[model samples]
Target chain A: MTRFDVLTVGNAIVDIISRCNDQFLIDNQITKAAMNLIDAERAELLYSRMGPALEASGGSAGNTAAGVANLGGKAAYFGNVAADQLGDIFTHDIRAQGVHYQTKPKGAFPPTARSMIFVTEDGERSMNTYLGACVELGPEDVEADVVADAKVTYFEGYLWDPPRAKEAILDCARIAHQHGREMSMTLSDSFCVDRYRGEFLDLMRSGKVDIVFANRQEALSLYQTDDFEEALNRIAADCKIAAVTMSENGAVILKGRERYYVNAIRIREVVDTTGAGDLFASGFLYGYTQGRSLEDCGKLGCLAAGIVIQQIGPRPMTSLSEAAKQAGLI
Target chain B: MTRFDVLTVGNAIVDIISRCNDQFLIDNQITKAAMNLIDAERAELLYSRMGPALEASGGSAGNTAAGVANLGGKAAYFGNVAADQLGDIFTHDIRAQGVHYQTKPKGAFPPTARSMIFVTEDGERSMNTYLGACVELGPEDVEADVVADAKVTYFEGYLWDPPRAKEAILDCARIAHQHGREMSMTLSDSFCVDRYRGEFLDLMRSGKVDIVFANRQEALSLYQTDDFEEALNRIAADCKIAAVTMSENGAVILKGRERYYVNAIRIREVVDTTGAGDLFASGFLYGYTQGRSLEDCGKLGCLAAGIVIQQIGPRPMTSLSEAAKQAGLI
Candidate 1:
């Protein structure tokens, strides 16, 4: 029998987070609320000028894996990290969170991938990412046994950016399906959807993917439509089971003839909106693996998403398992 | 003319903070509310079993340097860190806060000093400190120009644990007085005062120390009395200015024949009490450097201490200058 419930594959990134004002963003020519990819040199340049920052483990699917582990789920993560101090911190952080991680640290590569997250006063984030060791993630790193042992094989759409990691994602998805396991992937961001619209559409329509997690922007971008109703209809017809988040208005989960409109749980404050979508998938997938209904899954997703937004970073300060129990989701 | 407002010399530490329950302290046989010195092996053992942690720059006087810098004061710091990654992080954080730091990174001994702070739910903090490279801080690290260029030299009493830092502290104090600058010292903890009571009292009585900082427990340990008034009377008659903190009861500032009892500011919550005293010294020293009245200095100290206890770390999320202005202390 499989030992793990969820297995996540994504870039293993250390987030160097700092607070900056709107004027500083303009001065730096940063696109106010987007993840802009840069080389290692640019990452160094930005960090040199930026104020004091808090270093934390953060990656799209990596955060989801951490969330699942925090929920007491048997989770495993597959990602590449450099053999450096920041990488060691990132490695220790997830392993300490009780996730099984056996990926090798590559000394041949540059330092671990790091995203310089500039959080504005309004709680919006503009990221400058240096995809260092993440570029080393290829199909060979994916252990078929590990992927086959998980109930759901989860990967991030952001991993599709690197040419090699795209192959890694595709290969993992192939292996998961061959082992009769459910395979899920997130639409990651609106810009990511823009970059690989056709391939992503093929990933869903070709029967290679079972569950597709996304936010409103990514969903609307996927179908290339400005109309919300139009994209919702298209995504419903395209994927098997789709969990689409609508930010504050809540989420709309649709599967064929059935749909659940889960209202967004209110938060007192939104410190950073970095991992709201990623955490939603964590709760939804945890519920899915638990043989729960789509409505309950969406509600748990909303609860988890709400909790992450009330604080900085994607990691949950409070245990998601306890939070779920308190919310009566289990 | 002095080139700096306040210059500090103390342990250069990277705080690895974790959240634990009250029972975890008991299970590990840790002192419930004190800083316990541990070797590298014990630090490794405790960290392996501890939950997830957040890393921040923290040392008693190091935080005071950051606070002084945050309050727009020209501050400088002298300490020791090994040529390691945590050392780099410690260096960058303090420098980013606008404090001048000139300590050379040593490769001869341990890595940078680190304090594993276990913050319980009630906001009480129990610390396990590994002196590491902090033990390498000798009299040689104390540059004469840096000591003489500062109007006031501040140091933490905990440095007395490492026999060499005591020599560094004494050397810096001599040079500060040689250049006609004021010297300040904080009775870092009650346990710390217990170890160096005679030396601390002698330092104050001999006029080598002009200003002193201590919390209630430390003050009681210093004057050899549990009676608050008795301790206050002896301290008033001992130092030129003695700022004594009394937790929620506020603080008392005694200088010569004059005395002022400043009230503690109410906070919505107390997240971590790690750097409360350090920040109090920051406020008081900044006020003193600006020629503010003793009463106003105590108020500013209380205000700054209030802001830090509301957050998880010793560092202030809000700039101390802005917080001071909001409290009408600036």
Candidate 2:
């Protein structure tokens, strides 16, 4: 039996979330609703001009791992953080959420990774990440035992930004599939998809990625088309299973000839849309590991996405297991 | 002419706020709605058992300084933090809020101070603080010029927890009064008042403190009395001006024979009650420095307290100046 339902790998980051007006984004030349990679100098310059921020543990896969654990699923995580205070916070927060985290840190040369996320009035978060100690994640950190122990090995597209982490990701996928486990990947951002469109398609076509997760923009960006159905069919044809989200429009899941559409849970307010996709992946992966139907998995994903958007941070403040049971989903 | 409207001194602490149920508090043996001191070992143990948390810059006086700056007033701050990642966050957040902070950090021996605050369903927070680098703050860190160049120099009674910070606080009070500037002190918590009641009364009676800030519980604890009017009259007779807050009931302000009672603003929800008193002081100090009447100052204080309770973090996410202008309070 698998020791973990899901294993997530990504850059470990502390998110500094601040609220700003649209003019601030315009003045700073930051793109809205996109993850932009910045050097340390740029990170420093931008943070100096930003307003007071709240720091929370948030990396794409880190949030997913936390969500899975919060939903009463056994989760394991692999990421890089420096031996610094932010790393302590990141470690404490994830581990406290009941995720098994064993990755160690190096000396305090580059400090921990940090993402300065600015949320506008429209609830769109513009992320500027400085990949500090996350650059240290390499193939050596990925253990075969852990990968084989998990039902599915999942990673984020943002891992490609850190050169060494790609090797680690490939290693996990190799070990996972070799031991009769599945591998999944999330198209973290549309810009990230544009950056590694060929590589992502190659991974899916080569059968290295069993399940693929994407949002409408990322799907469109991958196929380089405005037609949503065309991109959805292309993605479905390329992967064994594909789940695509369309914000308030709901989600669509496809497996071979079978398909399911799940309506988005109606929410009162959209506070910050930073972790919507990641939490959706958490619920979907949890349901898939539990041998639930495709429709149920899509509904679980939609439920999680709805809950995350109504809160401030990337992770859930309440127990998702209790919420799911209360909603009569489990 | 004064360069700053208010100068505040306190221990620099980063608040690690998490939402937990009452059962968790009972299991952890944490007192509800009280500030508890924990050592490094206990902090580590408690955090290991806690849920995921968000970190924000918060100290009693630090929040007041940020509130003053956010309300379009010139504010300066003095506190101690070690040269670590958390220290960097504390420095960056306060400076980015437009508050002048020049206190330099020492070597990374003890690390920055942190408070693990657990908020229950009723919005009451139980704080457990680890006074790390704040213990390094001494009278040498207090600058005479910064204290003299302010209309009011405010410090939290929580400063007494650190052995050396008490000296720095007294030095600020001396410089503030010597330069014909006002000095204010907030009886931070009821437990804090009980710990330093005699010294607090001596400060007010000796004319070292021109203004006093307290909540109803703290006022009652200060005099060891159950009668609200008795404690109110005792405080009024001891200080030149006194501001006492009564949670949902409202606030009472006293100046000689004149008294004003301001109603608390009704809020739809109470997210966290961490910074209510601090923000109240921010508005009162801002209005006092602007030469507004006592009633207007009390109203401004109530307005600020109302806004703070409706949010998650200690400091205001939106500009308090714009909020005041919109409400026609400024």
Give me the candidate number with maximum lDDT. 2
lDDT of each residue in A86-151, candidate 1, tens digit only: 787788888899998889986846778889899998788888999889989898788888888999
Off by over 4 Å in 2: none
Deviation in angstroms for B262 in model 1?
0.6
Name the TM-score of candidate 2: 0.98
**Tens-digit lDDT track of model 2 for A162-226:** 88888998888889988999999999999999999999999999999999999999999999999
* lDDT of prediction 2: 0.93
DockQ of all models, two decimals each: 0.58, 0.91
Docking class of 1: medium
CAPRI-style grade of the A/B interface in model 2: high
Residues B33-55, model 1: lDDT tens digits: 79999987898888887876777
Error at A284, model 1, angstroms: 0.4
Candidate 1 stretches with Cα past 4 Å from truth are none
